[PDB]
């Protein structure tokens, strides 16, 4: 088997058509991942300070 970067090239990055479709798929999966991941980091840093954390007290 050739290296992982090489497999990525032959499958995704060689044809500019696949290169662009890769970017659009990747952008979706990155967006959701990054947002969810960064929100977690924020809300942990501000545990119990946010309306989201104290919402339960008045419902």
């Amino acid at each position: 088997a050739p290296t992982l970067t090489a497999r990525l090239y032959s499958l995704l990055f060689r044809r500019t058509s696949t290169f662009a479709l890769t970017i659009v798929v990747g952008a979706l999966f990155f967006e959701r991942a990054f947002d969810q991941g960064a929100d977690a980091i924020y809300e942990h840093i501000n545990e119990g300070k946010l309306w989201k954390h104290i919402k339960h007290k008045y419902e």
Binding site: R14, R15, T16, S17
Partner: protein, 289 residues
Amino acid sequence: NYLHATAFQGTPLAQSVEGPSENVRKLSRADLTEYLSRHYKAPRMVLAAAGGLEHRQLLDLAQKHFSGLSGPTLSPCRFTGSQICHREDGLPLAHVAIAVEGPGWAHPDNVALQVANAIIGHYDCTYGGGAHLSSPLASIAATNKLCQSFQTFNICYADTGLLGAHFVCDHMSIDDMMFVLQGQWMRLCTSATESEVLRGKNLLRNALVSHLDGTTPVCEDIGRSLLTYGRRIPLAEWESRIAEVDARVVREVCSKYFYDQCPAVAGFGPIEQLPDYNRIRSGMFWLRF
């Protein structure tokens, strides 16, 4: 010489045939005789002949005079995507030579690459065709007076080679020549047509059938084929390999060697216009296919 020197840099293929002046001035007779006995050996040699002769007779003559002949492996050569630019504005025309790494003697792809190189072909200012020339590179080059001359090549060595083109042009045309040439490489890679490949096939069929005319070229074909392939490949076999090539083949074969690959560039003379390597390298792909 520059193309090889940069293409196969840091190897024995970078070396010129004639050697540096330093060596010529210093090589003693001891060096020459040592070189001879090391490399001139019966298994690394072929006696070829063509004309009016009985094969049996040649073989017996070989016995008589070449019996005393005695009885060093080549390392592969690393191709490098590189540029050598000898800028010399004092000279009146610019020479540019560009190539990607070719497959080398043995490889069957060479036949398909020859077909592709025949499509693009060659041109100079004394050619009768002009605008009506079949090669788009040639017709564009002729009508716009881009170059004085150009040829595609495919140079074969043992495990490697130089596949590309050389052109000679006006100092203001180098960028345009490169653009049209690289444009042709891309068009064959992505979108070669059946009829133009048929033309290339027909050129190549005609090329190697009429080159082998008279005894000297035939003798040489025997001599060298035995060294490179280990046999003479008959014309009927060449024809079978050529008929096998269609538009799909030319695309797939060209895309292997040309598409998104780092070339070796050599330029000499008034080369101020000769494109920057990055621009040349970006010219090795299309943003569509």
